[PDB]
Amino acid sequence: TNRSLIVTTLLEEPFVMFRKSDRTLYGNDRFEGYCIDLLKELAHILGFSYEIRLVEDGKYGAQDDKGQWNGMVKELIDHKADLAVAPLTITHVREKAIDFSKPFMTLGVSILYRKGTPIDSADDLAKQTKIEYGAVKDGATMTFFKKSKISTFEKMWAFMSSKPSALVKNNEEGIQRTLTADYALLMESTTIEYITQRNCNLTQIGGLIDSKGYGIGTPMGSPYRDKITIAILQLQEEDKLHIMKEKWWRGSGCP
Ligand SMILES: COC(=O)CC[C@H](C[C@H](N)C(=O)O)C(=O)O
Ligand SMILES: [Cl-]
Ligand SMILES: [K+]
Numbered sequence: 525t526n527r528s529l530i531v532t533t534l535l536e537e538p539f540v541m542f543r544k545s546d547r548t549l550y551g552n553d554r555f556e557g558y559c560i561d562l563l564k565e566l567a568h569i570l571g572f573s574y575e576i577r578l579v580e581d582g583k584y585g586a587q588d589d590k591g592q593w594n595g596m597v598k599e600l601i602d603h604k605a606d607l608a609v610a611p612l613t614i615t616h617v618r619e620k621a622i623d624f625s626k627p628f629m630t631l632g633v634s635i636l637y638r639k640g641t642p643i644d645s646a647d648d649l650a651k652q653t654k655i656e657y658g659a660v661k662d663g664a665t666m667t668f669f670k671k672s673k674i675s676t677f678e679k680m681w682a683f684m685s686s687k688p689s690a691l692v693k694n695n696e697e698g699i700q701r702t703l704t705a706d707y708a709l710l711m712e713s714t715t716i717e718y719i720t721q722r723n724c725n726l727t728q729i730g731g732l733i734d735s736k737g738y739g740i741g742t743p744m745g746s747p748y749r750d751k752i753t754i755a756i757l758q759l760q761e762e763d764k765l766h767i768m769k770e771k772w773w774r775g776s777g778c779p
């Protein structure tokens with residue numbers, strides 16, 4: 525098979541971003557970031573070409589009450605894309621719809637909040653309402669709380685899903701909310717690490733709530749899944765993914 529693979533993705537710093545230039549850019553040249561470096565490395569190793577496209581609805585992917593998916597997950601289900609290359613969380617619920625490569629990065633859910641009120645955990649959030657909290661709508665973190673059998677997280681989901689402001693359109697909007705309101709954002713730990721190094725009034729609250737990985741998504745039965753997995757595992761063993769992360773995360777710290 526010689527054709528270029530269609531890659532669906534989402535803007536999400538520092539994984540996928542619009543490259544800065546004075547020229548009007550087009551095609552793959554528009555994009556840079558951790559996930560673009562990973563895609564280039566896989567493309568080199570495995571000898572394939574690709575065309576990157578932004579998912580129209582700007583969502584990662586979750587199910588509605590009818591069971592229908594949206595976001596990048598839906599793109600893969602409909603075979604509108606060959607690969608989803610993004611910080612896409614590997615979950616068993618999504619495995620009902622799509623396949624994933626093995627993880628290229630591990631992480632956990634944690635809390636992003638303004639330094640100030642010394643809350644120390646999700647339990648501190650769960651037992652009150654003065655500090656509002658939420659997550660990105662139709663993402664893995666939202667779904668984690670929605671499906672949780674943990675009593676504290678159930679309480680949190682009950683509040684989140686009743687407060688129409690709590691679930692934000694995207695990470696950026698969630699971060700802005702933490703900066704402008706008494707609001708704590710439930711979000712993934714490596715992104716929190718990135719944010720708190722650049723926004724010194726924000727901090728991570730508590731440790732990791734859980735453990736998971738980001739993987740490259742594919743339609744079920746993709747002929748590319750297995751070779752992508754092998755290449756990712758190799759890059760991981762040779763510490764190439766650690767170096768790639770250091771590349772995109774490094775910068776000046778905070779006082
Ligand atoms: C790292 O990307 C983000 O922070 C976007 C929001 C994420 C999306 C998540 N990685 C997903 O795959 O649905 C979340 O549900 O917390
Ligand atoms: Cl929506
Ligand atoms: K080709």
Ligand SMILES: [K+]
Pocket residue numbers: 544545546547548549
């Ligand atoms: K430009």
